[PDB]
């Protein structure tokens, strides 16, 4: 029952609830926003670039330039604002897609919403460098940039012990090869198998495994571990100085 009214008044009253779940909340924050049309996105990008050129032209002519006409100034300011609002609307449309691709790295390392926001940043960079001259789907180009951003952020913020990005790369490579090697052979692959696989001496795998180790919170139970973690020499040093005296 659509225009049953009551049936939509209930929906409106349900829209105004407290709700404490942030993932549900953001699910509804993009809830209000809708999808986008490819050609509509093309026009959106066109307006974005136009407003950008307009603002930079303002900045260039701001120094030793010209007293621009009131109508010309008004229209160009409006184009710039239109471009800003166009990119805001475009990002609003893309939040759904970025959320949908960010749900695939959950359950590990960091918060799902954290993944969402890092993906949003990747999306901003994607629109920052989107080329529609060929006129292809925006999402297909975007996925690479969002995945780039979220993988970067995961690497930079994964562990309490900071490891360089190159090392994140070699570690997840090591894990993937380990997994597939077990899947094929079924026997634990020896470190020498990995050493020859990557063409390295029999040490890199050991160091990379040691880096891959996750720290164990001193908080534990069985009672936390922190309690159970560790005057002859002090007295001796004072005595030896006196003995020199």
């Amino acid at each position: 029952e659509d225009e049953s009214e009551a049936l939509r008044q209930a929906r409106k009253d349900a829209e105004l609830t407290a709700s404490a779940d942030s993932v549900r909340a953001y699910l509804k924050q993009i809830g209000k926003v809708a999808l986008l049309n490819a050609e509509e996105e093309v026009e959106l990008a066109k307006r974005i670039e136009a407003g950008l050129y307009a603002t930079q032209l303002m900045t260039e002519l701001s120094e030793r330039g010209e007293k621009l006409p009131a109508a010309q100034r008004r229209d160009m300011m409006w184009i710039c604002r239109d471009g800003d609002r166009a990119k805001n609307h475009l990002l609003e449309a893309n939040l759904r897609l970025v959320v949908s691709l960010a749900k695939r790295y959950t359950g590990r390392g960091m918060a799902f919403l954290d993944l969402i926001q890092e993906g949003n940043l990747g999306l901003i960079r994607a629109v920052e460098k989107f080329d529609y001259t060929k006129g292809y789907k925006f999402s297909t180009y975007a996925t690479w940039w969002i995945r780039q951003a979220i993988t970067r952020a995961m690497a930079d913020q994964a562990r309490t012990i900071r490891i360089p990005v190159h090392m994140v790369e070699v570690i997840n490579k090591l894990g993937r090869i380990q997994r597939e090697l077990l899947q094929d052979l079924g026997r634990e692959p020896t470190p020498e198998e990995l050493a020859k696989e990557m063409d390295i001496t029999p040490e890199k795998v050991l160091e990379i495994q040691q880096y891959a180790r996750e720290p164990i919170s001193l908080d534990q139970t069985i009672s936390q571990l922190g309690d159970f973690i560790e005057a002859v020499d002090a007295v001796s040093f004072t005595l030896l100085q006196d003995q020199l005296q």
């Binding site: 490579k173 090869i177 696989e197 990557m198």
Partner: protein
């Protein structure tokens, strides 16, 4: 389609052996599933004879195909841009197609580029896999001591 014990090419898996055609009366009709076995893990496939040609049930190419692919892998000048994605996806598609000429072209290209510089990790695995399937089908067509088959493949490929 094939009798018992025939040799069959079922891509992307390649060489396989047929043992019988058990006609499973499921769905009220005796589905002449040609029971087929592969070499990777002795997997068994039941392919309907009604649509056997549709799913890719076929035979190893004769010596005419062998000489054609020899000429194909002999041909230089196959160009490529600086990036990697184009060739990766291209060879993915042409290896999934279950073809003999295109797999040979891509494996030749990847061999020469590896010999030049050395590319990456997984592309070495794809090179190996393609060489293995090519050697398998070559031995299947010639029955020529598959170790000898890979040796001669290397010899002609190096040229």
């Amino acid at each position: 389609i094939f009798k018992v014990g025939d040799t069959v090419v079922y891509p992307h898996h390649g060489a396989a052996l047929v043992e019988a055609i058990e006609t499973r009366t499921i769905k009220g009709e005796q589905k002449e599933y040609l029971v087929l076995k592969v070499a990777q893990g002795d997997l068994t496939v039941r392919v309907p004879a009604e649509n056997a040609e549709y799913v890719g049930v076929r035979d190893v190419v004769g010596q005419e195909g062998l000489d054609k692919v020899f000429q194909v892998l002999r041909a230089p000048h196959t160009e490529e841009p600086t990036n990697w994605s184009r060739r990766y996806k291209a060879n993915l598609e042409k290896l999934a197609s279950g073809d003999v000429n295109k797999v040979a072209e891509v494996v030749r290209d990847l061999w020469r580029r590896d010999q030049e510089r050395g590319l990456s990790a997984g592309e070495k695995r794809m090179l190996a896999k393609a060489r293995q399937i090519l050697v398998g089908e070559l031995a299947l067509a010639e029955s020529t001591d598959d170790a000898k088959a890979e040796t001669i493949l290397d010899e002609v490929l190096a040229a």
